[PDB]
Design a protein around this nucleic acid. Structure first.
Length: 156
RNA sequence: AAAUUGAAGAGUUUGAUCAUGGCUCAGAUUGAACGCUGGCGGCAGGCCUAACACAUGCAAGUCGAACGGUAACAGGAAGAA
């Protein structure tokens, strides 16, 4: 049911008395092709075990993003430690205009038409954190209407 | 009624990480040049540098319905053999 994407796999290291110990880290994202998406970061000595840990961590701690019919609902910007990210809704059939980790997380998150841009450092972990941060605090018309106590027609 | 519809990043500092920060690349474009190769057509373009020097040909003439005139043609009138 859920679609899982592997974003970046790199080899981290650790020096001990014996010498260098090489470990692997796996950044993956999972989602239901709709408002549910979540990212996982796993680490192990082998890449299959790393990707498996990442998928288990990704399937938990997911969030609900109040998205439109196929796009976002307003231009929103997010930040997490090095990646000022900005994204806005686009018309039908323009695709996912995004780079690196952003493309994978958006695609799995179900949006199909979006203009995005990554400022600052484009580190994959930080941008996928910042992207879901912006998505998490993205207001919806019903939420803002109920929040301010007015009708959705009054706010349009 | 339409007159807009619009935004991708990656490699590289470290044993490994994050940030700052420079270099490099993927794209589009030209009055272009060079290297290899080369079939046809349509529409454009062609001294960016020495505003350095120019042989030769052409690139401003027209009007006899402004005027004296006949230098040539070509006809007439007087003729002449």
């Amino acid at each position: 049911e859920l679609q899982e994407k592997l974003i970046a796999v790199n080899r981290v290291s650790k020096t001990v008395k014996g010498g260098r110990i090489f470990s692997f880290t796996a950044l993956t994202v999972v989602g239901d092709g709709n408002g549910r998406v979540g990212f996982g970061y796993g680490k192990a000595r082998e890449v299959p075990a790393a990707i498996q840990k990442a998928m288990e961590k990704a399937r938990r701690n997911m969030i609900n993003v109040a998205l439109n019919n196929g796009t976002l609902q307003h231009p929103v910007k997010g930040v997490h430690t090095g990646s000022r990210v900005f994204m806005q809704p686009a018309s039908e059939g323009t695709g996912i205009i995004a780079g690196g980790a952003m493309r994978a997380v958006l695609e799995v998150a179900g949006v199909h038409n979006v203009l995005a841009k990554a400022y600052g450092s484009t580190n994959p972990i930080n941008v996928v954190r910042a992207t879901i941060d912006g998505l998490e605090n993205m207001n919806s018309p019903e939420m803002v209407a109920a929040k301010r106590g007015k009708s959705v027609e009054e706010i349009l």
